[model samples]
Target: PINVAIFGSTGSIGTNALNIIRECNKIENVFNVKALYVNKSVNELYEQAREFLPEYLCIHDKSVYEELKELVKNIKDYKPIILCGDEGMKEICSSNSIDKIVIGIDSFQGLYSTMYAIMNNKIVALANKESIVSAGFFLKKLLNIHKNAKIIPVDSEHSAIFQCLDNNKVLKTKCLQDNFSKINNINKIFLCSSGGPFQNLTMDELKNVTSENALKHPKWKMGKKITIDSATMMNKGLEVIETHFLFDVDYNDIEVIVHKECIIHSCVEFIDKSVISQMYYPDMQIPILYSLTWPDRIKTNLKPLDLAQVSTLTFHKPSLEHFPCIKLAYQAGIKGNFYPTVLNASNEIANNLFLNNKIKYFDISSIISQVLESFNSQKVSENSEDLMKQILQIHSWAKDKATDIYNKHN
Candidate 1:
């Protein structure tokens, strides 16, 4: 049985992952739960602990530790040691008992813990594109030290690419260097998007869109932040940046397509100009299971994709004029040094503001653009002990700047 630890266990990706583990554990005994980590979802943690009986539980907040301790005390079959604070997350990733880590959280938080996992030579089933977008270079550096470690992308597009490159199976990567293109005739990667709810809307219509309407994703069910991102096509852009780092592909080789059906998760064009596509019914579990199972396939209760009933599949070019987020992401990636960092950080703040109804939906791009443009002239420094601090500092500065601009615009 494979031993696994899930960071952000209460989140959507983590929950579905545990579901797979639960079912697989019952019938096949395919996995053993080593640890479960959560930011603050004590009740869910307590329940999951009782069901899965993980060896360790890491709670982000110390104050909630005592409460969780009391709640899980009645687990008659097994009791887990609940470690407190962010360091506890580090401990689990570095734990000798944990075989692989599912990094369900995104951004720098995920990056911090993921480093420890890589440092200890643990396999990382990564759903966190923000981590890659913000620090793919830094992660490449980490891979230099821990040669045995690997990262399996839990996102659909990356998973598809992995399958295509690995002949539809998982491969052990020695850092990001172990890619399909390294050994195959993979010409280019086509990152697909659903074109989001605002795909067909005019810029004038988008300007008047409400936050509630914007979150209605037609293709896949996702978290609010990601859903908002999908609307702006920023998620696609971020994934493009992620694909560059993940696949060791040139920006010119990676192209984005609007595949509205969501059937084709992603595709790869080969040297002969022949394209291979990974198709499914837009299920997150498919990718999650692929990451966990690695190098193989398994039987699942989830329904498989049927092309007959699904009928038609279509594709188009993304409208960069309407949703400028994708363009911004490419610009950030092209600029390199701390541009991606500021882009991610500033978006998080602006995204939160839009979600909270503090700013207009379209205001997200404006604020992010403002920050990127402002920093265009600023010199980006090399990675250091102060990298995270510098990123956060810029994040804070962008948040304040965005807020100030938002206030004046209204």
Candidate 2:
């Protein structure tokens, strides 16, 4: 059985991962829960501890430690080691007992843990796209050195690409050996977006949109941050950068298509007049399961696709004028020296401001754009430390800019 460690165990991805683990356990025990880490959700942490019974539970907030201690004390089967703080998360990543790490954390703080896991030659089922977006070139270099380090994309679109490639044996040795000469000719990746709730909204309409409206996503149920990102098309932008890094595809080769149906998760077009696509219900678990049981298909109780009930799949081109964040992401991807990091940090700050009612919904994109433009003018370094420093610098600038903009509007 594979030993799995989960980070951000209380969030959507973490909860879904647990659900999959529960199902796997029922079906002959494919995995052993090694450790679970959460930022600070005592109630969920208590429940996860009881259900999974991992070897260790790390909670970042010390304030909740006593509460969690009392909760875990009541569990009879086994007593798990409890650790606190950011250091605890690092320790969990470096644990010898963990065979693979599932990164469900939503922010760039997970970058070091991800890098540590890769350096140690551990399998990483990555849900954190910002880590790659922030450290694109550095991560590429790391993957070259760590031969055993494999990053399986857990996000639905990337997972769709993974599943499609897996099914078609695209990366198989036999296929590569036979098609070595035609490798450069076969390169195209289609990124599918649900278009959020604002896909059809006019710019004027979007300007007046509220958090509640943005949060009401039509297809997928996700966390507030991601939901807001989705509404602004910034999430798709990040995914575009992620696609470039994950598949080693050029920015030109990757295409974004808005598919409202969301049944066809993603598609890849080859030079040999063939298109491979992965389709399923709009379920995150399918992708999560695929990330775990890669190179081998495991029978899952996941809901199967039924065309009879699902009548039509609609596809449309994203409006670049209305959704300028997508264009900004493309621009950042093209100019790859700390620009993506700036874009991510700025968006994060803007999103935070918007969430706190400091800015209008539409200002998120404007603020990010202004930050990106400012950073591009300065031209930050590509070195990891340099990039991180510049990101901090730009984050400060962006926050100030956002505050100014917010106050001006208010």
Candidate 3:
């Protein structure tokens, strides 16, 4: 059986992941839920514990520990251990009994669990792009030290790219025997974007959009944070950084095109100019299922694509003038220091501020750009510990800087 744990199990990705597990488990008892974690959704966590009956459950918000424990105290013959907060996360992620961890967490909070899982040489199905955008360098270093650790991206774009590469076996051996660059044969990577809810809207149009307007993403049903990200196209920008880190592609080699249909999740162009792409009915379950059962495909009861019914597929060039966040993300990725970390931290802060009605829609990128421009750091670290320390310090600095920018303007 493939023993699995899900961090942030109450979110959209996490709930869908459970659906995938339930669907897959119908055929054979091949997957087991060893543990689960959530921020503060105690009711939902209780429901999941009652059904999945995982051996352990963790809640990041410690105040609800008693309620969680009380809710799960008697479930027929089930008596699963309940845990709370960060230390519990570390314990569950590092345990040898688990075979896979689904990191469906948002923002930089996922970084610690990802690091812990890698340090223990476990497979991490990473859905949190913010963690990668902020500390991908650190994660890469951990991958080097723990060669057996495997990171299969759960995001649709990165998953599509991973499938197109078709080098899972090679990458597994390469992680141990060679450097990351050893898997290189790619000429270009094209990451497709849906252009968000306001793809064709003018700058003036975007300036007036409320949080409710931004949250209505045209395609996927996701959390509030990522839904807002899609509206700004900053989601695509962050994905650009994620692609660079995950596939070892150069910033110049990566390009983004707005595919309105979203059928072609992403594609890669080889040295021979041959392009291979992954197309599917737009469903998050496809990527989630693929990440779990990699090097092999699974049978799911989801809808299949028929081109005849939807015969039109269109593409557009993203206007950097309208969505400057994409440009800012590329610049940060290219700068290759504390810049990406700063960009991510500031974006998180500003993105939240926009959602809270503290700033306008366009202010998300503006605040982040200012934070990036002013963030100057020459202190270089020699080891992972020092590097993490620097990353956290800069992360805090960027957050404060973004908040200050908001205050100054208002």
Candidate 4:
């Protein structure tokens, strides 16, 4: 049985993962959920712990640990060992008992844990795209050093590429040349997006968008931040950068189209005359299962697609004027220094400010653009520690700047 460890046990991905695991447990003896971790969300975490009865549980916030401890004390048959703080999360990731680690955490906090897992040569079922976006170059370097470290992207687009790439059986040396002389397989990757709620909004209309409006995604259910990013098309931009790192493709080679139907998750057009793509219902569980059981298919209860019922599909070019966050992310992709990290941090701050009604809807993009421009003028970090310090420093600076801008208008 594959022992699975899940991070972010309270979020959307985490909840879906738990539901899938429950179904998996009933039908097959293939998976054993070993541990679950969450940043806070004690009540939800407690509920998951009761259901999974994992040998280990990690909660990052120390203040809630005692409450969780009491909650778990009454549960019979299984008693999970609790670990606290970032160090505890790291310990969970590096644990020998965990065969696969599903990273469902939202932000860059999972960055170090992911690095540690890779170093320890564990299968990374990664849902956290920000970690890769923030430290993709570094992660690639580490992958080279640790041959056993394998990454399985849990994001829908990247997972589709991963599934399609599985058809090619040639070794890395035979399939793609690394040095100057050898030739690679693909020229470009076309990533598709279900342009979020504001796909057709004009600049004037977007200026009046509310959190409720932004959160009403047409296809998939997701967390607040990601939903907002989808509304701004920044989520698609982040996926573009993510595809570049995950597939070793050039940033320019990846393109995003606003496919309203979302039936076609993503596609890969190779140097050859063929294009490969993966299509499924807009449920994250499918990709999550693919990541967990890669190179093999596990029987799943997920509903399959019915082509006859689905009539038409539509695609449109994303508008830069209406969704400036997408444009800003593309700029960050081109810059490729620490600019992506800076942009992500600033956007997080800006989105939160907008959510709180501290700033107007359009102000989110404007603030992030300003922060990115200011951050680009700064020097690059010398090392990983330096990069992390730079990220924290820029986060603080951007937050203060966003607050200042919010105060100036209100």
Candidate 5:
């Protein structure tokens, strides 16, 4: 049984992953659910612990630790170790007991636990795009040193690209090489998007948009933060950065196509102009399961895609006017010092503000843009250690700057 530790157990991604693990285990006990971690869902964590019966259970919210422990105490024939806070997460990630760590943690917070997992050479099934978006350079640097450390993207689109390309060789080559070379026989990479809820809305219409409407994603059911990002198309922007880091594809070669049906998750173009793509229903469980069983395909009980039932698949160029975040992300990726770090942190803060109804939907991109333009720091670092230090500092600065922008807006 492969020792698996699922972080962010209550999130959409994490929950899907658990579902996959459960289905896979129906045939045979393949995955040993070694540890489970969540931020604040004490009751959910306790239930998961009782069901999975993992050796370790951790929570980020120390305040709810007592509640979690109390709930778990009543479970029959199980008494798993209860751990709390970031230190507890660190301990789980760095543990030799954990063979694979599913990092479903949202935004920049995942960076720390991800770093710890990589440092200890664990196979990281990364669902957190912000970690890669903000500090992929450093993440790749860490991978170069810890040669055994493998980071498999759990996002549907990236997973599709990884599968279309030879998953093992591409990822293995990237893991071994310190300097990432252009992948041979690859002409272009096509990242597909559902075009979000406001894809057709005019700029004037966007000004009046609220969080309630933004959270209502057209196709996918995701965490609140990313669903909001999708509505604004910033999720695509962060994914652009993620694509670059995962595949070492050049910023110029990468393209975003708004596929209204979302039948084809993503596509890859060969040097010969031949394009290959991966298509499936919008369920994230397939990607999560693939991340766990990469270099191998296992049977699942999930429904298969019937092409005849869902006929239309459409594609269009993304509008820079409405989805400015994509343009901003390209700018940051091209000018890769601390630009991505600032962009990610600023957007994170701005996204939170919008979620809390502190600002309008349009403000998410504008605030991020303002913070990016305002940043004039020369604190770039060459090594991973210095890079992380720089990331923390720049992250704090960007957040404060974004907050200030929001304050002035109000």
Candidate 6:
């Protein structure tokens, strides 16, 4: 059986990873959960460790280590070697017991954990967009050094691209062409978005956008942070950077279309003039399963997709007037320096400010835009030796600047 370690075991993706493992364990004899890592939330992490009985349990928040340790006594039969903090999380990523590493952690921390896994040359199934957004080029450098490393996209859009590309080792071989003539072979890649809850909201209306309305994402069930990011269309912006990282596609070649149906997760166009798209009935488990069992399809009880009942698949270009965050992401991505890091770090803090109701909904983008402008000319370390430190330093600065902006403007 394949042994897996889930880095964000207490979050939405982690819960679903366990769900798929549980379902497949009954009939397929597919895999086992060997390790679990969580930021905090002792209750959820404790329960998961007890149920899965992993060999190792890592707690990112050192503050709750004693509480988590005390609670594990309730697991009478199974005892996992518990660890805490950055070193603890890194230790688990480097374990020989882990056959696959699933990254579920959010934001910046995801990059560190994913980096550790790649350094160990482990197979990674990743869903954290901020990690890719902030450090795609840096991670690509890591991939070059550790030739055994592999990353399978877990997000629906990237998963769809993985499916369309149809090669488990495709990324390992650096398919990125050095020039424009070869860019045509991989004609284009389309990342689909459900257009979030604020799709029809005007600027005046957005200023009054409440958490209640923003959280009501029509397409998929997700954590609160992603829901708000979706409403602002910033989540799709993050995914655009992620798509570029996963497929090695140019920023211009990547397209985001508003597909209200959410059935067609994503699509790719080839030089032969053929477009291939992967469609499923908006389920995270499908992508999770695909991530776990790449190059091999597992039989699940999920219902089949029937298109006739839901006729008329409509598509349109994303409106930057409504969602300027998309343009912001493209700008950061094309700038090819510290800009993406600034966008992600600032947006995350601004998202927190909005979630707390300290700022208006539109201020989320406003703060990020201001931070980007504030640091537009700043240059970061160009060496991979300094990548992690450089990005973290910028992350700190942008977060601090964003909070100050919120305080001043609000």
Please provide, for model 1 over 71-109, each residue's C-alpha lDDT reduced to its tens digit, 9 standing for 90 to 100: 987889676777988778877877888888999986567
Error of 6 at 368 (Å): 2.4
> What are the Cα lDDT values of the candidates?
0.82, 0.79, 0.85, 0.77, 0.84, 0.82
Kindly indicate the candidate among 3 and 6 with the higher TM-score: 3
Quick one: best TM-score, which candidate? 3
RMSD of each: 2.5, 3.7, 2.4, 3.2, 2.4, 2.9
For model 2, the superposed segments whose C-alpha errors exceed 4 Å read 167-186, 353-362, 377-397, 404-410
Error of 3 at 47 (Å): 1.8
163-188 in candidate 5: lDDT tens per residue? 78765447547531333324445678
What would the C-alpha RMSD of candidate 3 be, to one decimal place? Answer: 2.4
Off by over 4 Å in 4: 63-73, 167-184, 216-219, 377-382, 402-410
What is the TM-score (0 to 1) of candidate 2? 0.88
List where candidate 5 sits over 4 angstroms from the true fold. 62-70, 175-184, 216-219, 356-358, 377-379
Tell me the deviation in Å of residue 100 in model 4.
0.7
* Model 1 per-residue lDDT at 167: 44
The ten-residue window of minimal lDDT in model 4 covers 173-182
Candidate 3 wrongly placed segments (more than 4 Å): 172-184, 207-212, 216-219
What's model 4's lDDT at 62? 94
3 versus 5: better lDDT goes to: 3
How close to the true structure is residue 354 of candidate 5, measured as C-alpha lDDT?
89
Q: Write the per-residue lDDT of candidate 6 for residues 1-410, one digit (tens) a residue.
A: 88999988878888899988888888787888999888888899888887888899888788999998899988988778899989998888778888799998876688888889989988889888788777776787787787788778898998887787646345325321133214335678888999888777787887798877887655567878888888878988988877777666789989999998899999989878799999999889989888888867888877899889878798999889778888988988887688888899999898877787888776777888899988854555568878777778888898899988887876
- Report the C-alpha lDDT of model 3 over 229-252, residue by residue, as the tens digit: 888889999999988888777899
Residue ranges of candidate 1 with Cα displaced over 4 Å = 167-180, 217-219, 358-362, 376-384
lDDT of 6: 0.82
| Model 2 per-residue lDDT at 166 | 42
Q: List the residue pairs that clash in candidate 4.
A: none
**Local accuracy of candidate 2 as per-residue lDDT tens digits, 1-410:** 88999888888888899998899779778988889888879888889888889998999898998898899989997878899887787777778888888888865567767877887777888888877787666666666667677788898998887776644444432110224213434478889998888887887997888877886655566778888888888999999998877776778988899998888999987777588899988888888877777767677777778987899889889998888889999998998877787788788877777766677776888888877777644564656667556656765675676566656767
Q: For model 1, where is the 10-residue window of minimal lDDT?
A: 166-175
